[PDB]
């Protein structure tokens, strides 16, 4: 994925080929691992969606399909097939 920035926070641009894999990237705070469970993750196209993957410390995820373990990260992917 392409790692960029959104208002100073990390921002991942995820493509279809990355469906199902842990998204790792180094940060000043160490290695950040974000988990992406987006069922509608498709090919990158004009139909993108963008939202935040919150930092989860010691809590099961609820009503979300993206979260990270060290730093809250923004995510963007396309839904085209």
């Amino acid at each position: 994925f392409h790692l960029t920035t959104r208002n100073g926070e990390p921002h991942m641009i995820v493509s279809r080929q990355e469906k199902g894999k842990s998204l790792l990237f180094k940060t000043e705070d160490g290695v950040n691992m974000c988990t992406l469970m987006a069922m509608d993750l498709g090919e990158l196209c004009e139909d993108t969606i963008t939202y935040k993957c919150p930092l989860l410390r010691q809590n099961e995820p609820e009503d979300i399909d993206c979260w990270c373990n060290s730093t809250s990260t923004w995510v963007t992917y396309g839904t085209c097939t």
């Binding site: 919150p54 989860l56 809590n59 609820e62 009503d63 979300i64």
Partner: peptide, 8 residues
């Protein structure tokens, strides 16, 4: 929307 420990 409902928020809580499970989502930050």
């Amino acid at each position: 929307v409902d928020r809580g420990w499970g989502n930050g």
